[model samples]
Target: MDDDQVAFSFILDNIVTQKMMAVPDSWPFHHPVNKKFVPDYYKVIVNPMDLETIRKNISKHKYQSRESFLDDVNLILANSVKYNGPESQYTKTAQEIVNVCYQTLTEYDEHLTQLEKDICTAKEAALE
Candidate 1:
């Protein structure tokens, strides 16, 4: 699952991001799917504060809210729906993009909740 996570994270870091377009442009010419599927794929939802390495600088706080993520998906569906049809060979890949975004968001929220629980537990222990 680590490979899958990394692949999805890298793709999202390119597509759901803004500053990534200037990095290497590999995603712009990515195979199987391109402008027809994701026009604003090069756009960034959140900037990493002028960091050198996005991989190292990006944090949970840099991530967008659920609403922002949903809007991106909706925009893709509306603007890129032509390339997302059943006839498209990469429909499954496009669907995977949606799935990964939802899963990642859920995972982040669960992780944050877990962190809060741990903090509460520590506080209780300290009190005792």
Candidate 2:
């Protein structure tokens, strides 16, 4: 697909940003954390003092289930598979991302579980 045929100027031009809780790399258990790919957006905004420093810092709202995040992820990844857009290695296995997410959440809730203490502080993010 070419610009002449299809124009995805909106979505393609924007970087996908996701809000997730931040967990520490020193957790009691070992995560399959083999890659530097902790959702690139998360790495950009990491704060050592934000409090969610040890829970993997996924979504701030704990009520938002892994399924919800996966849904959002699906939407974001789907954008990459567009006929005219560039190919994304992550999107290539979007389904697997969901599977891994659910699999971990189910068994690792003890450490993966999020709470108020496991999130970013509002004051720090207040643009001061």
Candidate 3:
């Protein structure tokens, strides 16, 4: 999970924000996906920090607004995956980002599942 978070953040910083592209001399030798997928710019939708990390960073807010947190979670995943698919260097990069984000999302879901069970147990004890 840590690796995925780091990987996605690195991609966002270096490739997505920097506008990575094939050097002129390297263009002919660049992978087809790399060559064709060069974009003028990539919007920094998932830049700085994705939702899961942000939640941990601001744990207080997680308690305040689970709905808003989940909305950001979904948005981050959707934005990360948007660059996925197709056979280009950009697509490959997008895939990597998606993979990283998914792993984090899974981890978050697992933790939430356990937390929900624990909360219910607390409720039952109080009700008794």
Candidate 4:
């Protein structure tokens, strides 16, 4: 796999672990919702996604691209918000995870950009 792909997987792993630790209410999101407890969940959530599924995808290299990986993450958060109600703590925790993930993604992009610039500068210096 490419360095970029590897980097993204590492980033996702960190995001999952960090959120699970930081948000106590995020425990429910760690695995798929139980059908026994919430029978209507499958009916309400057409395409269910969870953090464990995401981790599995990463390990299996199932994600074709970053967009695909992000789509799953977004689905997980959106499903929680839809099923848990806007005012519910689960919804709030989903939003918090969204914010943290977005911030981390932004930082990762900036880091990659800086690395590109440094590489170019180093190359130019070597040519002189």
RMSD after Cα superposition, model 4: 6.6
What is the Å distance of residue 51 in model 1 from its true position?
18
Q: lDDT tens string, model 2, 2-30? A: 22101211111111121121112222112
Rank the candidate models, highest TM-score first: 4, 1, 3, 2
* TM-score of each model, in listed order: 0.36, 0.28, 0.29, 0.75
CA lDDT, candidate 4, residue 34: 85
- Model 2 C-alpha lDDT versus the unseen true structure: 0.32
lDDT score for candidate 1 against the true structure: 0.41
Better of 2 and 4 by lDDT: 4
Candidate lDDT (C-alpha), each: 0.41, 0.32, 0.39, 0.72
Off by over 4 Å in 1: 1-64, 111-128
Candidate 2 TM-score, true structure as reference: 0.28
Of the candidates numbered 1 and 4, which has the greater TM-score value? Answer: 4
**By lDDT, highest first, what's the ranking?**
4, 1, 3, 2
* Cα lDDT tens digits for candidate 1, 7-82: 3334446544533233242242122233356565434322211122333323322322345345545443332334
Query: What TM-score does structure 4 among the candidates reach?
Result: 0.75
Candidate 4 ranges beyond 4 A from true positions: 1-4, 19-21, 112-128
Candidate 3 lDDT by residue in tens digits, 59-79: 332322234434543443354
Q: Relative to the unseen true structure, what is the C-alpha lDDT of residue 31 in candidate 4, on a scale of 0 to 100?
A: 88
